[PDB]
Design a protein around this ligand. Sequence first.
Ligand code: NA
Ligand code: NA
Ligand code: NA
Ligand code: NA
Ligand SMILES: [Zn+2]
Ligand SMILES: [Zn+2]
Lengths: 186, 186
Amino acid sequence: APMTEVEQKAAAGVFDDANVRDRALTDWDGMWQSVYPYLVSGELDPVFRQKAKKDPEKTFEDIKAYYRKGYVTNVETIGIENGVIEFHRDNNVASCKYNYAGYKILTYASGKKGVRYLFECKDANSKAPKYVQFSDHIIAPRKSAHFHIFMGNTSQQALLQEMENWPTYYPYQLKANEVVDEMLHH
Amino acid sequence: APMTEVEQKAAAGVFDDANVRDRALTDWDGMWQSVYPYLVSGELDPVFRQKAKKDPEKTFEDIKAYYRKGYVTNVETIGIENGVIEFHRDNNVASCKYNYAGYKILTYASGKKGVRYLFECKDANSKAPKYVQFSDHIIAPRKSAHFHIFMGNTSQQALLQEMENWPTYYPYQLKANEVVDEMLHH
Ligand code: NA
Ligand code: NA
Ligand code: NA
Ligand code: NA
Ligand SMILES: [Zn+2]
Ligand SMILES: [Zn+2]
């Protein structure tokens, strides 16, 4: 099902807090690929060129740099199924069963808002991040099309303060051109 | 009289063409100062810092550079009264009686729109620019609060293509802090 007007506005960072709801980890079920490799190859260049073309105060160089810092990660693949998140970091792999920890509504310096969905790995000897936060422009149950994930081992509160790095994941099957297509429209 | 909702939207580059009307040169009557000197002194820095703070894809450096190219001019003062525009360019002065040449509605790369109000100096031995275009976020008769002015000697059509340089003028009496105040709010 395509987006209602309330969902479209919420995706653009405009929503009433009263509409925000809990979501289950299953919203992010599936196999996913980091888009960072496509920034590196130059394959996301059309996205940044359109962003630049549309705002004369911006430059390609600066927009790319912002997304470089945003996307950068060595976790190339993430798999989510049956309450478990699996992380593929170069040749290291880790997984853990995550417990839901609620959501947090944020207001950004821009005046736009977003909701993060918080999860915790409750192991001692897990190599997987203790704290994970999903942010995907959705404020109520809906299967994700792509997500940013904040990963940390210190606390949720501390992770909530991270604003510059947000490794970003699209469905594993997509090629670079389909990722670009979605970024330019969806 | 403060702005109606239609005027506020039009100032943000959103309007129906059916609402656009001719304006008389008297809308720009008064004495005016270039804001370029205030960019140079650093006194516009708070404006660019707010612009940067509000959009993480932008930088201060790039925003300032864009406005540097926009504001740059040696025409420090302009006076308008009785159908005549007077230009003070360092120690040179020129003036001419301008005839109204209509308006042109433009759509920018950003999808925002604006209206330019066209005037011509019809002399041979005038040192004043032959073609002048006012652009001030107003689409119908209203006394200007500040304006961009495109100045050229080649043709109106050619001047219509200028997008990067737009020397910008606020009422002559204002100090730097009042200019900043207006830029941050009005
Ligand atoms: Na509310
Ligand atoms: Na769970
Ligand atoms: Na119309
Ligand atoms: Na006139
Ligand atoms: Zn996104
Ligand atoms: Zn202006």
